[PDB]
Amino acid sequence: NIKSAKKRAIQSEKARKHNASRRSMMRTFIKKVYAAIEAGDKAAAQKAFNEMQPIVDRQAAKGLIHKNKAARHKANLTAQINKLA
Amino acid sequence: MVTIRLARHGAKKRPFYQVVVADSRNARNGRFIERVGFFNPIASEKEEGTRLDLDRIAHWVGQGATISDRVAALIKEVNKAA
Amino acid sequence: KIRTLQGRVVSDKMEKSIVVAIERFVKHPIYGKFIKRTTKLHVHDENNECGIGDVVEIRECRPLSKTKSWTLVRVVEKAV
Amino acid sequence: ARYLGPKLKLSRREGTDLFLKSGVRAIDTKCKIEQAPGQHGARKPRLSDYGVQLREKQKVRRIYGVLERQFRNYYKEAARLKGNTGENLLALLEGRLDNVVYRMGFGATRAEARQLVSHKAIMVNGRVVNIASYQVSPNDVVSIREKAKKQSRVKAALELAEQREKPTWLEVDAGKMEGTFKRKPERSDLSADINEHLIVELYSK
RNA sequence: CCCGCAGAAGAAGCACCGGCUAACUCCGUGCCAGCAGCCGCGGUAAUACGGAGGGUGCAAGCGUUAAUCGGAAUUACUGGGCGUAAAGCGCACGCAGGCGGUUUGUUAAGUCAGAUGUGAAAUCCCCGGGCUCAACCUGGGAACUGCAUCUGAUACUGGCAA
RNA sequence: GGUAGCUAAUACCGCAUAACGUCGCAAGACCAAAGAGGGGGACCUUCGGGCCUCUUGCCAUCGGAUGUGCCCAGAUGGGAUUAGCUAGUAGGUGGGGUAACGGCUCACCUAGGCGACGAUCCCUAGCUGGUCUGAGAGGAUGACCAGCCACACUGGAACUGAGACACGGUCCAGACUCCUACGGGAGGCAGCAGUGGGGAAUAUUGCACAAUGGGCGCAAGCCUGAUGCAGCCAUGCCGCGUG
């Protein structure tokens, strides 16, 4: 068909690439922090949480996660990490 | 948004409007929240044919509603007195 | 206040679970008779306090799990 | 619509003067009453109850010159309103413009009154009325404009009007071929031959 | 929407005519030709078949069919029936249901009062307005025969105790 | 479609800032963004503009309204010549995923849940305010006008977006057609008109953006088979004429 939707599709695919990159970033950091939790160390996991918080909060404030998922992740991770020590 | 539009129910070649408040995305004469008044363009010599309720439209303006051109001209024509 | 209903147990006890039934009359829309009608729910309880064949009130709350939406408050006439 | 036929056929079949010919010699040679025309209409037909109802309906219909659908709608409207059904029906039917024009005396027969109405003659409140299905309202004025003025028909009708009884509910007026409507007519002034209840009984079934 | 032009001009059809249901007489046909919704009508006189004339019913429409409801009290609650017609099991004995003698208190769950919220606007209805008249549009009421909550009523059933 | 070299921006990304915001019994850690335009006597000007004003826009809070996303209770066709159905099935414990509780999913422990006051299983149908009929109770019915659902050749998935699993937006599988140098590719009138075909049988390959509305734009303006009017059809309800 011939409409104005072609540029819309192109923008959609570009957004797909960008959001996939950011999601991969997020998942890699989540996996590393869970690995540190499984390791059993306290200081290393606390440090990992420390550099990890800013990126997830940045992605939340950019408008990519709806601003509520970040709070759930942070609260659950803090509750999980403080008990094991 | 929330607007104040016009809708008709009359027969062919004989209009009869009925000013109402509803949602923009809905149809012309379909879903509506609450009627507020009416206007008869063809009218007659008789005085009746232009009525409103100023209190309710003022309240709805306060809540954050907008206005249409014809209804604005109408209310300017009547106001409390003009 | 808070609306309440009263019922009967006639139920086994699962882990933190009881089943209740309630009764009330109604007028049939056709013949004018009155017929007993029974309805059944599921309840979330605390410390499995109540037992078989006991009278207990009930009230609703947040949905907890499937088919379980009401919880008890007070128990009156303990045991049979 | 309209009848468009031999009127004295219905005059003779009914068995009573129908006032719809209204010449000058209202005499036997015109009518030949009590004959019941047809091939062998001399024989007495031995009416039955349903026949009595149907014949009364025919009489009341032909006297006022109306078809069937209008009559049924009139009965519906009369029954909707409050009060006695028969009296209300007759009062409503009397209110037709052609009938009041005839009763004022500007004509001789109801049919010629309707003919006058259809040709844009009768005047009310300074506005022309086209149709005879109009319902007159209390306290109105009936008059004739100047285009149809000086027509000998209305003068002849005025002169022959006085042979009738000039019903009280309407003011005869006619000083300058101008009149005045007063009120709804009632049972007393109209003729007592017509029986209301039988029509209602007929529409019952 | 008004004014003007000699101008009767340019304009009526369709069903039925035995009872049910408004209206009949002749000619030809003579168990062939045929109708019809039930009764059925027809072998020499058809008020029923074919034509003619009259009559009857509605009319810019009228008849035919298909489909829905009442006449149907023919699913019967308001409102039927079971000796002889279509109908009482072959008899008993007893869970689950339904229904209960008669006092005195308590209880408000039935039930009944009053208020509040809610039953979207068209339509159905009553007063009026407008389009020359209605059809059609429309101003204000009316009911949406319930639902939920709160306050009261205690004669009857219901749960309690004697 | 691919390769090489150039260029802006409210596009994109780091830093600066950080609280009634997020996480927190507690300190504490952490988070964001944008220019244009209308003029200008005085001032700087390396005469472009800075500078003085005015309109709109961007980013955080807390609130108003308006839609959408969930739960429960009661009503919502016919068949006992359909009597037993159901292991993620019913709960409990802990983790993961959504805007949110949740068998929404995972590993473990219990022995359950539903049913003669119709469960499972069959045939049949979109649902209401209503319409028709009858006095009332009822009985059939869901034509147009309103309200709500579920559906866009037939099966499944998601990205994008505030809001689809998207009617004229993508990707596969399938079957139809149409172009192909035969290696491949395009396509879904059940949107207003219309043809072929089913049938007793239902319209014209029409006008206007002037009225109201919808979407863009500070506005002027631009589209709009939404709509408002047309042409046909005794299809109904009306009113009239044939003296």
State how far the Cα of D90 lies from the Cα of A53, in Å rounded to an integer. 95
Q: Are D185 and D169 in contact (CB under 8 A)?
A: yes
Q: Is D1 part of a structural domain of the chain? A: no
Q: In angstroms, how far is F190 C1' from A1 CA? A: 20
Contacts of A25 (CB under 8 A, 6+ apart): A55
Whether nucleic acid strand E comes within 7 Å of the CB of D128, the answer is: yes
State how far the Cα of D91 lies from the Cα of D88, in Å rounded to an integer. 5
State how far the Cα of D196 lies from the Cα of D204, in Å rounded to an integer. 13
State how far the Cα of A7 lies from the Cα of A72, in Å rounded to an integer. 36
State how far the Cα of C18 lies from the Cα of C14, in Å rounded to an integer. 7
Q: Which two tokens stand for residue D97?
A: 């413009």
Q: Which domain holds residue A53?
A: 1-85
Partner residues linked to C5 by β-bridges = C58
CATH number reported for the structural domain that contains residue D12 in this entry: 1.10.1050.10
Shared domain for D100 and D169, answered yes or no, is yes
Q: Which domain holds residue D157?
A: 94-181
Whether nucleic acid strand E comes within 7 Å of the CB of B49, the answer is: no
Q: In angstroms, how far is F7 C1' from A18 CA? A: 23
φ, ψ for residue D87, nearest 5 deg: -60, -40
Structure determination technique employed: cryo-EM
Pairs from B13-16 (Cβ < 8 Å, separation ≥ 24): B14/B42, B15/B41, B15/B42, B16/B40
Whether nucleic acid strand E comes within 7 Å of the CB of C25, the answer is: yes
Q: Are D157 and D105 in contact (CB under 8 A)?
A: yes
Q: Which domain holds residue B26?
A: 1-81
Q: What is the DSSP letter of C15?
A: T
Q: Which two tokens stand for residue A64?
A: 């990519």
φ, ψ for residue C39, nearest 5 deg: -135, 145
Shared domain for D85 and D110, answered yes or no, is no
The DSSP bridge pattern shows strands C68-71 and C43-44 to be parallel
Site of tokens 């192109």 = A10
Q: In angstroms, how far is F125 C1' from C30 CA? A: 25
Shared domain for D118 and D74, answered yes or no, is no
Q: In angstroms, how far is E151 C1' from C24 CA? A: 23
Neighbours of C16 (CB within 10 A): 13
Chains that touch B (3 or more CB pairs under 8 A): none
Site of tokens 């063809």 = B42
Residue with nearest Cα to nucleotide F92 C1': C15
Q: In angstroms, how far is F164 C1' from A71 CA? A: 27
The kind and range of the H/E element at D48 are none
Report which of residues 1-20 in chain B place their beta carbon less than 7 angstroms from any atom of strand F.
2-3, 5-8, 12-13, 15
Whose CA is closest to B6, among B74, B56, B55? B74
Q: In angstroms, how far is F190 C1' from B81 CA? A: 55
SS (H, E, C) D71-89: HHHHHHHHHHCCCCHHHHH
Whose CA is closest to B36, among B59, B70, B11, B9? B59
Name the domain count of chain D. 2
For residue D112, the number of C-alpha atoms closer than 13 Å in the C-beta half-sphere is 15
CATH number reported for the structural domain that contains residue D149 in this entry: 3.10.290.10
Q: In angstroms, how far is F67 C1' from A35 CA? A: 44
Shared domain for D136 and D69, answered yes or no, is no
Whose CA is closest to D105, among D170, D47, D45? D170
Q: Are D150 and D189 in contact (CB under 8 A)?
A: no
Partner residues linked to C27 by β-bridges = C34
Shared domain for D57 and D127, answered yes or no, is no
State how far the Cα of C1 lies from the Cα of C18, in Å rounded to an integer. 25
Name the domain count of chain B. 1
For residue D191, the number of C-alpha atoms closer than 13 Å in the C-beta half-sphere is 9
Site of tokens 């409140």 = D125
Shared domain for D141 and D107, answered yes or no, is yes
The kind and range of the H/E element at D40 are none
Shared domain for D78 and D61, answered yes or no, is yes
Name the domain count of chain A. 1
At how many Å resolution was this determined? 4.6
Whether nucleic acid strand F comes within 7 Å of the CB of B62, the answer is: no
Report which of residues 30-69 in chain C place their beta carbon less than 7 angstroms from any atom of strand E.
30-31, 34-36
Whose CA is closest to B20, among B46, B72, B57? B57
